[PDB]
Structures are given as structure tokens and as C-alpha cells.
């Protein structure tokens, strides 16, 4: 029973090998107080982590140490590691092999130093970082297809056929989950509300969590909700106010399907995944279209499966069956697959024991994965 702990920027999720459900999951916020201490004897904590920190955002500043699949400001991410191991999952690492997760190709130096930091101080027995998509594939029991996890920090595609991780068509994209929230900030300024600070900026992803459904034929649905007041929806902040969101409701997620709104000049996800399809052989396209699997988070938006099916079948020749696999086990499929992989006995020989690292130097992760 080793361990499995996701790295992804949004929600550091911790659990045990084999178990079908992460034992503890919490947002990866790291907080610091932004005002002087006034009631002597508080015994203030000098930093806060996770849902404890999220509890009292009122006097807190929020640093996400994980942006775009790059681990920045390593001090706080180490703090998150420390809080995870001891408080959430509650075992010393000294007696548990550990496995982490990592987006396709983020930088070179990232793993090459992260293995060191988590392998020298925490003194873990053994570790092996596994690229996200291949793990996602295992999680669904399909050993052939294209993965689109789009974990909040980064979105990417891989072609995987008959269990081969065909590298060169890996098509990464930085259309992250958080940036939908950030754009929603700018679109919500227009209806007259304002969300300047950081705490409210955290709230808005919550308000995004429920009220963002992507709709087919964006033009017609847009003019539809413009003409009729049918879908005018309401919601309340933990303030007392109630906020009325109009067509922003379905103008949020469509930044995914076209980035012209956010500005980035890189085609929407459907065109990228079709691209990565068309950058393989003329025989692998027979099956690839059939096993398309969503994964990660940021795809729990209702409808996105169907809209995706429409766009692809329009793009691909209308002689293939594009039936896409979108189980509702999403947002965790990363972790399920990770646990299953840690459960494979043949997998035991793979990862790196302390001896190899000590006698070989840090590069062992890249050299042996």
C-alpha cells in the first residue's frame, strides 16, 4: 500500500493505493494574514493551508503556488506537502512509497528538482512521477484513445493506441481552468457588479461551479437568451446580496471552444484534439475517433460532451462514429487511475528506491521515466 497524491494546481487530493476514492481532498490555497495583530494572545499561525485557510479568507491573502503546471514559490508548495502528509492523510512518509502526478512536458527542471525536495527532506522510500494522460486512461479501463484532462492548470491531448504513448502529437495548451474564472471576472464587471479583491476572486469560481452550461449553436442560443428572459438565474453570495446572471452563464465556458474572447491566438480545444488526431497514421484514425475520453476537471460543465461531439463530427469525415466516453467519474479519474497503477504488482519494480537516487544523482527521474 504505497500512496497516491495528485499535484494538480486546483485540488491537491490525497488517498491510499488501491482505494477507489481519495481519502481527503482540499483546495490548494496557501494563505498569509494581511493585517496587523490586534488582540494579544491569539497565538497566530504564521501561515495557513487548505480548507482551514479557505475558512477565514476574510483577513487572508491567497497565493496559488501552482500555475500552469509549473510549481512556483517552492516554499509554500513544500508547506502543502507537509500539511498533506501529516494532517490530512496522517502517516509519516518514512513508511510509504509515494507517487505523484505531472502534466505532459511542463519544464525539464521541474521534476528534476521536485523529486529532490520531496525525496531528501520527507525522506520517502520511493517515488515515480507519471504523466497525467496515461494514468487517466488506466482509470477508465480503456487502453486506447485520446485523453483530454484539462486539469485546471493546463489542458492537453495525447494520442494513445493499443497502449502506446505516441509522443510527437502531444498537443499542450495553456487554456487553464482558472483562466475561465479570470475571464468571468471581466465579463461580470459589465452587469454592474465588481469583484476586485482576491477573496471574491476565489468566490467567483464557486459561483462558476453551478451557473455555467455550454450550449450548442452559440449564436442562436445567445440571441435566444438575449430576446427572451427565460433563463435569467439568481444566486447569493455569503453577504446577503443576490446576483442575477444573464447570458454570461453560457458565455463563460465557450472561451474553451474559441479563445478569441480571452485573446490567446491558439485554436479551441476541439480543433486541437482534431489536429492531434490528424497528426497520426491513416490507420489509427479508425479507432481513435471511437474512444475519445474526457478526464481531469473543468469538464463537469453540463453539455460540454455533446457540444464536443457536434464539433468533432462536423470536422471529421462523416463516416466515423465519434461516440465520446465521458463518465461522471471525472474530476477524480486522475486519482482513481493512480491508485490502480499503484496497485499493480508488476509495477512494483519500476519506481526509484533511495539507493538509485543516492548513487546516481538527481537526473534519475528523467533518465528512467
Amino acid at each position: 500500500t504505497a500512496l497516491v497524491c495528485d499535484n494538480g494546481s486546483g485540488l491537491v487530493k490525497a488517498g491510499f493505493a488501491g482505494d477507489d476514492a481519495p481519502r481527503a481532498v482540499f483546495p490548494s490555497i496557501v494563505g498569509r494574514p494581511r493585517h496587523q495583530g490586534v488582540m494579544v494572545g491569539m497565538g497566530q499561525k504564521d501561515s495557513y493551508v487548505g480548507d482551514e485557510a479557505q475558512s477565514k479568507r476574510g483577513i487572508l491573502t491567497l497565493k496559488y503556488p501552482i500555475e500552469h503546471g509549473i510549481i512556483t514559490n517552492w516554499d509554500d508548495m513544500e508547506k502543502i506537502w507537509h500539511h498533506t502528509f501529516y494532517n490530512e492523510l496522517r502517516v509519516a512518509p518514512e513508511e510509504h512509497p509515494t507517487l505523484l502526478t505531472e502534466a505532459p512536458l511542463n519544464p525539464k527542471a521541474n521534476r528534476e528538482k521536485m523529486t529532490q525536495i520531496m525525496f531528501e527532506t520527507f525522506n520517502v522510500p520511493a517515488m515515480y512521477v507519471a504523466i497525467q494522460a496515461v494514468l487517466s486512461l488506466y482509470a477508465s479501463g480503456r487502453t486506447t484513445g485520446i485523453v483530454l484532462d484539462s486539469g485546471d492548470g493546463v489542458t492537453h491531448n495525447v494520442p494513445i493506441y493499443e497502449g502506446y504513448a505516441l509522443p510527437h502529437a502531444i498537443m499542450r495548451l495553456d487554456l487553464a481552468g482558472r483562466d475561465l474564472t479570470d475571464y468571468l471576472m471581466k465579463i461580470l464587471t459589465e452587469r454592474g457588479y465588481s469583484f476586485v479583491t482576491t477573496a471574491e476572486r476565489e468566490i467567483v469560481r464557486d459561483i462558476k461551479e453551478k451557473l455555467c452550461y455550454v450550449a450548442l449553436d452559440f449564436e442562436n442560443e445567445m440571441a435566444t437568451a438575449a430576446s427572451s428572459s427565460s433563463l435569467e438565474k439568481s444566486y447569493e453570495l455569503p453577504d446577503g446580496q443576490v446576483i442575477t446572471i444573464g447570458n454570461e452563464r453560457f458565455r463563460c465556458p465557450e472561451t474553451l471552444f474559441q479563445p478569441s474572447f480571452i485573446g490567446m491566438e491558439s485554436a479551441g480545444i476541439h480543433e486541437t484534439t482534431y489536429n492531434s488526431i490528424m497528426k497520426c497514421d491513416i490507420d489509427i484514425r479508425k479507432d481513435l475517433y471511437a474512444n475519445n475520453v474526457m478526464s481531469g476537471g473543468t469538464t463537469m460543465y453540463p453539455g460540454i460532451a455533446d457540444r464536443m461531439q457536434k464539433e468533432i463530427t462536423a470536422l471529421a469525415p462523416s463516416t466515423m462514429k465519434i461516440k465520446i466516453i465521458a463518465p461522471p467519474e471525472r474530476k477524480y479519474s486522475v486519482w482513481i487511475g493512480g491508485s490502480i497503477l499503484a496497485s499493480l504488482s508488476t509495477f512494483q519494480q519500476m519506481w526509484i528506491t533511495k539507493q538509485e537516487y543516492d548513487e546516481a544523482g538527481p537526473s534519475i527521474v528523467h533518465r528512467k521515466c
Binding site: 487530493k13 488501491g18 476514492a21 481519495p22 461522471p328 499493480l344 504488482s345
Partner: protein, 531 residues
């Protein structure tokens, strides 16, 4: 009353009484090792041996007629064998007058419920309930009285002219009553046993443009639901969308038809097994005691060594269980002879007689051996039968000196891989193994089970890497050997003369096979090669 083992004519009442004497001296538990099953003609031996031991009470047997019905299973060869292990212990205090005897079953064959072999037949109880005799209980149980209607039963032959419970249903019902059962629990047992059949009618369809499974055949699901009381709609729903927790338990969802067909069978198997063990608890209840009983001499009955045609997973499991006890025997006799020869110390040949078996124990169990490969293979995506054997050949051929391949097994269907045990080279074909061991213990239905009749909640309230029969089995066998690790052994065997049942006269074809299988020849091998 003395004559330890080589001072009296050969006789086992002697050795059992010597065990009594050991109890008097060492004050420590003893274990009776009965080889062979009722299929070996044994049943009439410990039924007398136990009374013998009690001499220096009749409630012990009364359990047998009923517990047989859920435990006797007719096989391909040597039919009508109780395939479940029932370790049986009789407690003595420091005094020596019998205070009580509690009974605990070990390593029940949990996979016999579904995917039985076509040639063989299921548990006797199923066909007991089948026969129209006592049709009022069938009226309670809503069964149509036709074996081939249902999926689980239709695998069986259900026509065994040698022995059917048609008469035996009266005796089993009578015992099952007079063992102190209220009528409510009495007919509830029938209710659960029937429902375990009754799932077999469940039928599912593949959802459009999607993956999960919708329920088909509402009426049989509803009859089941009434039979266990719980609502049909929520049951089918908990089938189509099980709940999996998170850091806060949102109602997570996901299934596939194949997974569902596997899982419902898993649930049936688990509920039946736990039902059986609870009946064991009730048998303890009607036999309860309150005297100071602490020192017991235990008789355990185990399935015999199995070698015959067309042997799947089940045979591998049973054989492994049977031979581990021989590992225990070899180590034990080695210990005693070790100290004895030590008193005459000159030089020992080769310590730890147990190595002879360890050489194959590692192959069956030790990580990434054989049993581990099935555990890994069910987990791995797209379980396909042939890939299993491909992996085995890749991993343990030549690398393992006990994993080889047979050739042209004359008339019996082609086995794939073979092992060289001491008792007999074994041949298996691994068809259906991936199906056999996959069994996901769905939670949501388990939690749904609490709001029904007293039995099912009572059974399933008391009590994860997707437990599969292999792991549960290994753990339980380790439990058993632990209980024997904390005891001392002695050995009682049984011999069958012939199928024609002619007493007094030998018939060589059979006895040679049983003697070789039983491992008495292996003990003679140990003595022969050694001091």
C-alpha cells in the same frame, strides 16, 4: 489409556487419548487432521471419535444435517462432497468434563455460487428448494419450481439420480427447526436463499450513445425487492449509479453493463456466504454455554487433494489450501524429529523439510507469482483470457522451475499450463478465470440493505482495493494456519476401497491414487530420503 504410539496395536483412539494426556500435561490445544471428505467414505469416523473423546454431547451432530445442505456440492468426480471447511473444536476446562464445543467454518468455497462447471451441480439446498415437495415454502418464496428458468441454476445439471434432497428436505427442515429457530427466521432463511437465486433473472440493456446500464425486467426485480422487502426502484437505481465518497460525499456515479453483471453476482455471493456464517453463529447460539471452557482439542475437515479432468481456478484454490496443511505437517514432524535427533546429535541431512513445498508455495503466492498475476490482471484494463497466459509464460517460464506446459492430454480438453507438485502434476485451462475472480463489493446497495427484514440487516450490518476472491482467500487461509500455528497436530486419514463398495476387499486402481494424493506417500518419501 497409555502406550504413546508404538507400544500398542495400531489404533487411533489410542492417539486421540494420548492427545487427551498431552492436554493433561502440557495444557495446550490439539488439532485433528482429517484428510478426505465424505466422498472418501469418512463421515462415520469422527462421529464416533468425538464421542470416544467425550467418554473420558449429541448436539454436535445435529448441526451436520442442516449445514450440509448449504455446504455439500456434487463435483465431476467423487460426487456429493462437502466442499466447505468446518474446523470443529470441543472445549475442556482445567477439569476435563465437557463444557461446550463451538464450531467455526474456514475457507468456504465462495465462488461455487456462480459459474459452476457445466458438468457439475450446485449446492444441495438449491435443489432441495427446487423439488415441489413442501410446496408451501415455495409459495412463500415465489419460485416457479423449474430449475432451468434461472441463470445461476441453469449452469447446473439439476438431475442427479444418485442423490436428491427430495426426501432430505424433510430432515433438513426438521433439524433447521428443532435447532431453536423461530418461524420468522425460519422462513426468512428461505427468503434470502431464494432471492439469491432470484437475481439470476435480472437483465440489463446498454444505454444509447453512452456507457452505463439501465434496468430491464421490472417485474422480477420487483418480486425480488418485495422478497427482501426493500423497494425495487431504489435498488435498481443503486445498481445503475453507485455512490463513491470524496472529501465530502457527493453522489458520484459511474458504471458499465459488464461491471454490473459482475457486481450483482459478487453481491449475491457475499450475501450468501455471510448468511451461512451467521447460521453458524445461530448454531453456536442454540448450543451456548456459560462454564469455564478454555482448552480445546479441535477436529478440522478440509477438502481433499483434487486431480481430475478439466480443472479451473476452483481446483487451484482448493489444492493450494490442501497442500499448505501438508507444509504445516512437514514442518511439525521436522521440529520433533529435529529435537529427537538432536538428543542423538551427529548431523542433520537438510533442515526445514518445508522447503520441498516452499518451492511451489512461492510460485503460487509470492508477489508476482501466479495468484498475484490474476489479482493484477483483473485490475488491468481489457481483461482478456489469452493475455493472462501470455504474461505467465513471459514471467515464470524457466525463471520458475515449477511452471511448465503439458502436451496432448489424451481425451480431456486441452489445458494450457502445468505445475509439478509432489502429489501430482496439475493441468489447468484458464478460461473464465478473469470472470471468476472479478467481484466488486458494491457499497450503495450494502448501505441500502439496512431497512428490511431482520435477517439481512442483522447479517450485513456487522461489517477496499477491490477485494477479489484471491485476496480474501489468501487472508483467510493465513488466519487458519495461524490458528494451527497456535496448536499441535495429529493425523487421521481415510481410505476408499472401491466404487463398487465391496468391503473387506482391496481394489488397487483407486487406493493408489488416494494414497499418492493424500501425501502419506510424501511423508514416506521424507522418511525414505532421510534418517
Amino acid at each position: 489409556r497409555g502406550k504413546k504410539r508404538s507400544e500398542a496395536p495400531p489404533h487411533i483412539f489410542s492417539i486421540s487419548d494420548n492427545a487427551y494426556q498431552y492436554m493433561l500435561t502440557d495444557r495446550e490445544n490439539q488439532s485433528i487432521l482429517i484428510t478426505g471428505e465424505s466422498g472418501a467414505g469418512k463421515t462415520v469416523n469422527t462421529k464416533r471419535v468425538i464421542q470416544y473423546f467425550a467418554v473420558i454431547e449429541d448436539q454436535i451432530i445435529q448441526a451436520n444435517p442442516a449445514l450440509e445442505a448449504f455446504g455439500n456440492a456434487k463435483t465431476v468426480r467423487n460426487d456429493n462432497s462437502s466442499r466447505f471447511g468446518k474446523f470443529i473444536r470441543i472445549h475442556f476446562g482445567a477439569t476435563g468434563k465437557l463444557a461446550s464445543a463451538d464450531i467455526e467454518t474456514y475457507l468456504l468455497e465462495k465462488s461455487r455460487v456462480i459459474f459452476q462447471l457445466k458438468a457439475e451441480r450446485d449446492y444441495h439446498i438449491f435443489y432441495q428448494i427446487l423439488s415441489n415437495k413442501k410446496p408451501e415454502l415455495l409459495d412463500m418464496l415465489l419460485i416457479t419450481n423449474n430449475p432451468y428458468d434461472y441463470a445461476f441454476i441453469s449452469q447446473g445439471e439439476t438431475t442427479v439420480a444418485s442423490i436428491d434432497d427430495a426426501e432430505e428436505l424433510m430432515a433438513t427442515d426438521n433439524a433447521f427447526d428443532v435447532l431453536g429457530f423461530t418461524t420468522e427466521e425460519k422462513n426468512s432463511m428461505y427468503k434470502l436463499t431464494g432471492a439469491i437465486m432470484h437475481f439470476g433473472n435480472m437483465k440489463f440493456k446498454l444505454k444509447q450513445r453512452e456507457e452505463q446500464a439501465e434496468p430491464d425486467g421490472t417485474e422480477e426485480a420487483d418480486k425480488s425487492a418485495y422478497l427482501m422487502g426493500l423497494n425495487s426502484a431504489d435498488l435498481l437505481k443503486g445498481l445503475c449509479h453507485p455512490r463513491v465518497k470524496v472529501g465530502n460525499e457527493y453522489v458520484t456515479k459511474g458504471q458499465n453493463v459488464q461491471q454490473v453483471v459482475y457486481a450483482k453476482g459478487a453481491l449475491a455471493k457475499a450475501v450468501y456466504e455471510r448468511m451461512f456464517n451467521w447460521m453458524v453463529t445461530r448454531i453456536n447460539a442454540t448450543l451456548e454455554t456459560k462454564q469455564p471452557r478454555q482448552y480445546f482439542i479441535g477436529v478440522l475437515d478440509i477438502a481433499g487433494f483434487e486431480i481430475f479432468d478439466f480443472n479451473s481456478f476452483e481446483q487451484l484454490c482448493i489444492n493450494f489450501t490442501n497442500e499448505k496443511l501438508q507444509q504445516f505437517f512437514n514442518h511439525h514432524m521436522f521440529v520433533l524429529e529435529q529435537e529427537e535427533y538432536k538428543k542423538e546429535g551427529i548431523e542433520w541431512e537438510f533442515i526445514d523439510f518445508g522447503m520441498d513445498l516452499q518451492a511451489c508455495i512461492d510460485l503460487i503466492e509470492k508477489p508476482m507469482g501466479i495468484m498475484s498475476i490474476l489479482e493484477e490482471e483483473c485490475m488491468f484494463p481489457k481483461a482478456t483470457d489469452m493475455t493472462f497466459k501470455a504474461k505467465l509464460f513471459d514471467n515464470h517460464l524457466g525463471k520458475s522451475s515449477n511452471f511448465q506446459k503439458p502436451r496432448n492430454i489424451k481425451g480431456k480438453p486441452e489445458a494450457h499450463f502445468s505445475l509439478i507438485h509432489y502429489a501430482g502434476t496439475v493441468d489447468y485451462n484458464i478460461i473464465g478465470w478473469l470472470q471468476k475472480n472479478k467481484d466488486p463489493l458494491n457499497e450503495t446497495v450494502v448501505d441500502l440493505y439496512k431497512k428490511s427484514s431482520l435477517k439481512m440487516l442483522s447479517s450485513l450490518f456487522a461489517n477496499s482495493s477491490f477485494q477479489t476472491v484471491s485476496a480474501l482467500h489468501r487472508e483467510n487461509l493465513n488466519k487458519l494456519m495461524t490458528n494451527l500455528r497456535s496448536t499441535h497436530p495429529h493425523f487421521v486419514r481415510c481410505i476408499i476401497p472401491n466404487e463398487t463398495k465391496s468391503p473387506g476387499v482391496i481394489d488397487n486402481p483407486l487406493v493408489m491414487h488416494q494414497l499418492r494424493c493424500n501425501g502419506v506417500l510424501e511423508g514416506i518419501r521424507i522418511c525414505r530420503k532421510g534418517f
